Design a protein around this motif. Structure first.
Motif, PDB file in Angstrom:
ATOM      1  N   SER A  81      -5.036 -23.472  50.239  1.00 11.36           N
ATOM      2  CA  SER A  81      -4.074 -24.587  50.340  1.00 11.36           C
ATOM      3  C   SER A  81      -4.752 -25.849  50.866  1.00 11.36           C
ATOM      4  CB  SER A  81      -2.914 -24.209  51.194  1.00 11.36           C
ATOM      5  OG  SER A  81      -3.359 -23.699  52.447  1.00 11.36           O
ATOM      6  N   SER A 125      -0.078 -23.804  54.597  1.00  7.80           N
ATOM      7  CA  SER A 125      -0.129 -24.942  53.650  1.00  7.80           C
ATOM      8  C   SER A 125      -1.153 -25.996  54.068  1.00  7.80           C
ATOM      9  CB  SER A 125       1.211 -25.547  53.497  1.00  7.80           C
ATOM     10  OG  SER A 125       2.033 -24.639  52.859  1.00  7.80           O
ATOM     11  N   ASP A 126      -1.552 -26.036  55.342  1.00 12.44           N
ATOM     12  CA  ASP A 126      -2.425 -27.128  55.835  1.00 12.44           C
ATOM     13  C   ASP A 126      -3.120 -26.673  57.108  1.00 12.44           C
ATOM     14  OD1 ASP A 126      -3.672 -29.639  55.695  1.00 12.44           O
ATOM     15  OD2 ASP A 126      -1.840 -30.763  56.193  1.00 12.44           O
ATOM     16  N   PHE A 129       4.633 -27.912  56.131  1.00 16.94           N
ATOM     17  CA  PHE A 129       3.795 -28.166  54.940  1.00 16.94           C
ATOM     18  C   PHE A 129       2.523 -28.917  55.318  1.00 16.94           C
ATOM     19  CE2 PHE A 129       2.718 -30.236  50.867  1.00 16.94           C
ATOM     20  CZ  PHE A 129       2.714 -29.122  50.054  1.00 16.94           C
ATOM     21  N   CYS A 130       2.587 -29.824  56.298  1.00 16.55           N
ATOM     22  CA  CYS A 130       1.468 -30.750  56.556  1.00 16.55           C
ATOM     23  C   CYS A 130       1.347 -31.014  58.050  1.00 16.55           C
ATOM     24  CB  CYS A 130       1.608 -32.020  55.711  1.00 16.55           C
ATOM     25  SG  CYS A 130       3.213 -32.839  55.895  1.00 16.55           S
ATOM     26  N   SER A 175       5.661 -34.199  52.292  1.00 16.09           N
ATOM     27  CA  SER A 175       4.428 -33.759  51.580  1.00 16.09           C
ATOM     28  C   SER A 175       3.158 -34.023  52.406  1.00 16.09           C
ATOM     29  CB  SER A 175       4.341 -34.455  50.260  1.00 16.09           C
ATOM     30  OG  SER A 175       4.532 -35.847  50.428  1.00 16.09           O
ATOM     31  N   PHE A 179       1.359 -37.163  48.374  1.00 16.73           N
ATOM     32  CA  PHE A 179       0.282 -37.325  49.391  1.00 16.73           C
ATOM     33  C   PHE A 179       0.160 -38.778  49.824  1.00 16.73           C
ATOM     34  CE2 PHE A 179      -4.090 -37.706  50.950  1.00 16.73           C
ATOM     35  CZ  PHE A 179      -4.040 -36.743  51.926  1.00 16.73           C
ATOM     36  N   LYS A 194       2.883 -31.739  39.740  1.00 14.80           N
ATOM     37  CA  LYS A 194       3.548 -30.575  40.386  1.00 14.80           C
ATOM     38  C   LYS A 194       3.152 -30.381  41.861  1.00 14.80           C
ATOM     39  CE  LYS A 194       4.836 -25.786  39.615  1.00 14.80           C
ATOM     40  NZ  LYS A 194       5.191 -24.830  38.542  1.00 14.80           N
ATOM     41  N   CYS A 237       1.048 -30.996  45.642  1.00 10.31           N
ATOM     42  CA  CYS A 237       0.661 -32.026  46.633  1.00 10.31           C
ATOM     43  C   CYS A 237      -0.856 -31.917  46.842  1.00 10.31           C
ATOM     44  CB  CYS A 237       1.485 -31.894  47.904  1.00 10.31           C
ATOM     45  SG  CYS A 237       3.264 -32.114  47.602  1.00 10.31           S
ATOM     46  N   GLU A 262      -4.317 -19.819  42.819  1.00  5.50           N
ATOM     47  CA  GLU A 262      -4.245 -18.333  42.766  1.00  5.50           C
ATOM     48  C   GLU A 262      -5.271 -17.721  41.810  1.00  5.50           C
ATOM     49  OE1 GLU A 262      -1.138 -20.219  41.636  1.00  5.50           O
ATOM     50  OE2 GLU A 262      -1.100 -20.643  43.785  1.00  5.50           O
TER      51      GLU A 262
END
Ligand code: OJJ
Length: 305
Positions: free
Chosen positions: A20, A62-63, A104-105, A146, A190, A230, A232, A293
């Motif tokens: 990610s 995610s981050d 997420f971030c 995002s 972003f 799609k 970020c 993936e």
């Protein structure tokens, strides 16, 4: 000189799900990778040598972000927490609890006394690193957040959202200073400040990167040619050699643009899935890229320019 010549040096395998994000330590000795596999991995920046796995999140990550002194990490997880980690010990120092959906971030301020976070819960939170307590909850957006980033003196936070807005926030008060991008659409996938804090690099899910003047609130440059509708995908200011804009792409390439001219100066071929994340080494002409993936690997690239 006028074009970079990034060439593949190492492939880092170990993640068992989509990577990610990737981030180089400010002192340049490490690469940190986060993954949907719930792990952080630490790698030698120069030789890609696997150092350690950092574990504890109950769901995917995610981050991940580095403190200024390179001694801490913060991770943002689908388990609705962030965790602050001591890199040396690999130990969870604090679990930041308050988000009501996937985090997420994340990012530390330059002082590294604060962490900023963005969530699917549509809020931005500011956390005290020492105590792990939430200081402010900002009702920042009307859709998932995002990206979040502090400017060079820590006084500002920039956020982006699927609500199509980019907002800048006063760190001290958490009050909104301006809405930079104010369109129904497209989603802002972003945002980050330029190293001098004068400009904001913003991605939109119409295959577009834009460089904004924060003071004037005007678009200066547009960078296109890559695919982004799609995910970020991170984007970087490369500053060690030539002044480039670096981003991943849903066509499985790393794109490099000349910041001034907006010309594509290289496309890096190798990944076998979306390049979600790219990071630029603080001192050397080195890019790290990470893929979803199908791929689940991190690639280290080195340029003479
Ligand atoms: C829209 O959501 C996404 O972009 N992803 C990719 C992984 C996170 C990438 C990421 N960018 C940022 C930009 O601030 C933070 N984290 C989630 C994901 C993971 C695995 C499979 C499919 C989607």
């Amino acid at each position: 000189g006028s074009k970079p010549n990034y060439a593949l040096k190492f492939t880092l395998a170990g993640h068992t799900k989509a990577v990610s994000s990737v981030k180089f330590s400010p002192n340049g000795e490490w690469l940190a990778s986060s993954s949907a596999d719930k792990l952080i991995k630490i790698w030698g920046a120069y030789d890609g040598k696997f150092e350690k796995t950092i574990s504890g999140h109950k769901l995917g990550i995610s981050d991940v972000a580095w403190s200024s002194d390179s001694n801490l990490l913060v991770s943002a997880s689908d388990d609705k927490t962030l965790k602050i980690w001591d890199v040396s010990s690999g130990k969870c120092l604090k679990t930041l609890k308050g988000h009501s959906n996937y985090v997420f971030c994340c990012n530390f301020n330059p002082q590294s006394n604060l962490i900023v976070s963005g969530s699917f819960d549509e809020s931005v939170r500011i956390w005290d690193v020492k105590t792990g307590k939430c200081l402010k909850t900002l009702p920042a957006h009307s859709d998932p957040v995002s990206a979040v980033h502090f400017n060079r003196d820590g006084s500002l936070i920039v956020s982006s959202s699927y609500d199509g807005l980019c907002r800048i926030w006063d760190t001290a008060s958490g009050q909104c200073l301006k809405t930079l991008i104010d369109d129904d659409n497209p989603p802002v996938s972003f945002v980050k400040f330029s190293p001098n804090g004068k400009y904001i690099l913003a991605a939109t899910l119409d295959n577009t990167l834009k460089l904004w003047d924060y003071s004037k609130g005007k678009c200066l440059k547009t960078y296109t040619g890559h695919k982004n509708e799609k995910y970020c995908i991170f984007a970087n200011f490369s500053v060690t050699g030539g002044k480039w804009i670096v981003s991943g792409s849903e066509d499985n390439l790393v794109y490099i643009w000349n910041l001034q001219t907006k010309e594509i100066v290289q496309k890096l071929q190798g990944h076998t899935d979306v390049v979600i994340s790219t990071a630029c080494h603080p001192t050397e002409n080195i890019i790290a890229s990470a893929a979803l993936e199908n791929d689940k690997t991190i690639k280290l690239w080195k340029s003479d320019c």
